[PDB]
Structures are given as structure tokens and as C-alpha cells.
């Protein structure tokens, strides 16, 4: 199947300072969050769904026992795409920079304040890639969001 | 789950002489391949992903005397859609022409050289269907190519 969890709340998503380390609250607009509802190959969207599910489960369901694993075992496939982390595992096997889901990067407009959907920072041989080695991908993202702003 | 393999390499994909029976290099443009990354019901896209995975595994990973199928057992769900072959099995049961993934057909522009995404040649009673029995599908693909040409 495919995921069906929808992110809660104008129309964007805001990560609190609890979900981030050494950072404050960060908000992403509707035009970027809306991509998380149709793309099947975004790590940031899957992690954002995981965080949203955790927040809602804490808010609504009770928590008294020594925690539990049944809830996440039952609803794991409604939040993420397992073949995404399978693809990352294969890229790790073949000796290619891969994604370990910790760090993400995005382009943010200096004046308008708009933002692109974050893409995860690739890691190679135990250390993060440096911007000089994926500058083409950043430029492609800039092109894409220039085109988006054009409409 | 959903497949996450992305085809290797402007932006098209070329099947070499080893990938084809009694044929030479065949290259498909960017616009046709881009449909392989979003559609869920194309057999040619799954075959392309299988061939690409085989090529990359041969190139990068080593090999030894005996063959191990653990890799394909692990990574099958990130390449193909099993419900597609299930659909073909169901159509086979109900006495309808189906796809056995052996032969494909596409449309070539005589002058421009742009092509469409190849579709499976249906087989009924152990024999391939004649073009007269799927002429409407061919005409619809031609209409679609005209529509995307006028855009």
C-alpha cells in the first residue's frame, strides 16, 4: 500500500523547538507541505509524518504503562515508505553517499521569506558531504522554485 | 510500499545490445522516462528498473563462483510493483489477453525521432495479438503524443 497519514496544522507545517536540536521554531508554507501528499520519495516528508504521529499519539492517547510497541508496529506503513530506507540501504551497500535521516538543507528567500521543501544532507564515509559536492542539486532546486514562483 | 529506484544515465535511458533480442542500441527520451517515476501501472518501467538494478549490481558489487539471490529477495520491492504482475495473472485467469513481459510496442515520429513509452504486446492463446485487435490503443497513444506536442 501507500501512506495515508495527513499532516495537521495557514496550510503549512511548523516544527517546534522540541523537534529540532540547537534551533528555534521553523515554519514551512503550504506550497512546500503540499508536495508531501503526492511524492513517494521524500525522506523529510516521511520523518515529518513520524513526528506528527508521535505528537498526536501523545496528545490524545494515554501513556501509563512501560510504553508499547504495538501501536507503531501496527501503523508504521501508514506513515512512511519502507522502500525509501531500502533504497538508502542499497546506496550504502554500493559505496555511494546516502541519507541517514539526521540533517536536511533548504533554500530560503532573503526578502520574500519563502522556502523550498528540505532535502536530506548526504553522508559519505562517516562524514557529511560538503556543499561543493552537491552544488548542482542546490542549483536545480533554485531553478525549480524560481519556476514555481513564476506562476 | 512503493518503488524508489531511479533510472541511471539527457535524462533519457538507453537499452544496449545485450538488453535486447536481435537489436542494437535503443534510446528513449527524457519525456518518456519521466513518466516511469510517477506512474504505478507500467510494465516497461518495472522492466527498465530491473535491468538497471542488474547493471549497477554487476558493475559495483563483486561476484564469486556461486550465485546468491539474497540481494534480489531484499531489493525486489524497491524496483517493481507486484500488483502489476498480479493484475496480469488475474487477466490471464479470466480469459483476457495479458502481458508476459516479453514484447513491447511504441510509436516513432518519422522525422522528429521522439517516441512514446513502450507498452506491452498482449498475448492470447499463446500467440501475440494482431495490430488490428489493439488499433484503438495505438490511436490513443498517437493522440496523446499530438497533445503533448502542441504543449
Amino acid at each position, epitope marked *: 500500500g501507500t501512506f495515508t497519514w495527513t499532516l495537521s496544522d495557514p496550510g503549512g507545517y511548523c516544527l517546534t523547538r522540541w523537534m529540532l536540536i540547537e534551533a528555534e521554531l521553523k515554519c514551512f508554507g503550504n506550497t512546500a507541505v503540499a508536495k508531501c501528499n503526492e511524492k513517494h520519495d521524500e525522506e523529510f516528508c516521511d520523518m515529518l509524518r513520524l513526528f506528527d504521529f508521535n505528537k498526536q499519539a501523545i496528545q490524545r492517547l494515554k501513556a501509563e504503562a512501560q510504553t508499547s510497541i504495538q501501536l507503531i508496529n501496527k501503523a508504521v506503513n501508514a506513515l512512511i515508505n519502507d522502500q525509501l530506507i531500502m533504497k538508502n540501504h542499497l546506496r550504502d551497500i554500493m559505496g555511494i553517499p546516502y541519507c541517514n535521516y539526521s540533517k536536511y538543507w533548504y533554500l530560503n528567500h532573503t526578502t520574500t521569506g519563502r522556502t523550498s521543501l528540505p*532535502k536530506c544532507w548526504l553522508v559519505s564515509n562517516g562524514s557529511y558531504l560538503n556543499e*561543493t559536492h552537491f552544488s548542482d542539486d542546490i542549483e536545480q532546486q533554485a531553478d525549480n522554485m524560481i519556476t514555481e514562483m513564476l506562476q | 510500499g512503493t518503488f524508489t529506484w531511479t533510472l541511471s544515465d539527457p535524462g533519457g535511458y538507453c537499452l544496449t545490445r545485450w538488453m535486447l533480442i536481435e537489436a542494437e542500441l535503443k534510446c528513449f527520451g527524457n519525456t518518456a522516462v519521466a513518466k516511469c517515476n510517477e506512474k504505478h501501472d507500467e510494465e516497461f518501467c518495472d522492466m527498465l528498473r530491473l535491468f538497471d538494478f542488474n547493471k549497477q549490481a554487476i558493475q559495483r558489487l563483486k561476484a564469486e563462483a556461486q550465485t546468491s539471490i539474497q540481494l534480489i529477495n531484499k531489493a525486489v520491492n524497491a524496483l517493481i510493483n507486484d500488483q502489476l504482475i498480479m493484475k496480469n495473472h488475474l487477466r490471464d485467469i479470466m480469459g483476457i489477453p495479458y502481458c508476459n513481459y516479453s514484447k513491447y510496442w511504441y510509436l516513432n515520429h518519422t522525422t522528429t525521432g521522439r517516441t512514446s513509452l513502450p507498452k506491452c504486446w498482449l498475448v492470447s492463446n499463446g500467440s501475440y495479438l494482431n495490430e488490428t485487435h489493439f488499433s484503438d490503443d495505438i490511436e490513443q497513444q498517437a493522440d496523446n503524443m499530438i497533445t503533448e506536442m502542441l504543449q
Partner: antibody
Amino acid sequence: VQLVQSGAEVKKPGASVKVSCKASGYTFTKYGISWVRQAPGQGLEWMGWISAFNGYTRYGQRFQGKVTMTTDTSTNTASLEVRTLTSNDTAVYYCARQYPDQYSSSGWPRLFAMDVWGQGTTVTV
Amino acid sequence: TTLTQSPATLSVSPGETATLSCRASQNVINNLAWYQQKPGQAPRLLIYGASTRATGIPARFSGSGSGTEFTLTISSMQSEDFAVYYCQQYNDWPRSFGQGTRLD
């Protein structure tokens, strides 16, 4: 599009050599510069690669600490500095344009070779 | 990785083909480069990739091979082709160069 590597230098061993090449004919920031040393008689040998976009440096295994690379976007130049000289450091030094290797999440690595070279600078001790 | 060039000398008359071989220590998937250096001049890029030809290179130069063994062939040898030839891998750091062969 060419690169011009300063001029020939000779100096007493133990001092520092400061060779440079100015890149013209292309967007300097896009491509990095790799340094190759050829001793008299022997074959080519790699020194290190410095990116002109931000100054990221990848040094050779045996040239770490002994040599340094710098860039200057305002002057469109790349520079190599050798600290301690010895009788085996006499050679010819070449700076070669090289695009940074590119990686992406949705794609495969694209690695590059040295496209254009500059005439070498001879260093003797 | 380290890569070596077996022949190291190809004394041959003009007109006939010449074959040059390169072997790598580990796997280098189609990430080779053949450079030509005439005496007294800086090396120039002949072949990048396994078999792709650089711009401005005559068609008489061809590259082939992948993995560990690679080959370079010159069909119609001429007088200006008597130069040194170098083999480089760019699959991983640090970059490596061949010991070179002098086609005389």
C-alpha cells in the same frame, strides 16, 4: 580558457615556493583546480584539489602539511605554497581545471577528470 | 588504488595500429582517463570516461574496457603521435596516475 602558471623559479633549498596560475575564459567559481607534480624523468603525481566555490581542499596522502592551496575569486587565481624544499622537490608543477564531483539523492555520482591544463612551472633547488 | 601500464615501450613505424593497456588495483567502473604528453609540453586530455573522446581529438584514438582492464588503440599512427601516454583513475581519492609508456 587556458591557465597561465606564473614563471619559472629557482631558489636555495629550505625556503618556500609560491606558484600561482590565473584562470581566464570561464566562470572561475564553477570549477576547482588540481595540482600535479612531475619530477624530471618520472611520471605525473597528484598533489591535491581545491574547490574555487568555497575553498574546500582534498590533499594528497603524503603532501598534507607540507603544501597548501589557496584561491582568490577577486583575482581569479589559484595558488600553491610549498613550505620546506628538498633535493627531490625539483619538478614541474601543473594546475589543471577539474569540475567538482557531484552527488544527488535522486541520481548517481558524476565524477570528472582534468579538462584543461596550464603550461608547467619549473622549480629547481 | 594503484594502476600500472604493462607494455612501457611501443617502438613502431607510422601507419599501423598501436595498443596500450592499463590495469587497476581495484574496481574502477568506466572512470578512466587517457592523457597524451608530447615532450616539452603539458599533458592534454585524450579520453575521459572509459571510451568517450575529448573535444578536438581525432577519431584515430579509441578507448575501451571497464572494471579493471582497459585498452587504448590508435588506428592510423602518425608522426605527432609519438608521445608519452598516461592512465588516470578518478573513481576515488586520492587520484592515481600510471607509470607511463613511451610510444616510440
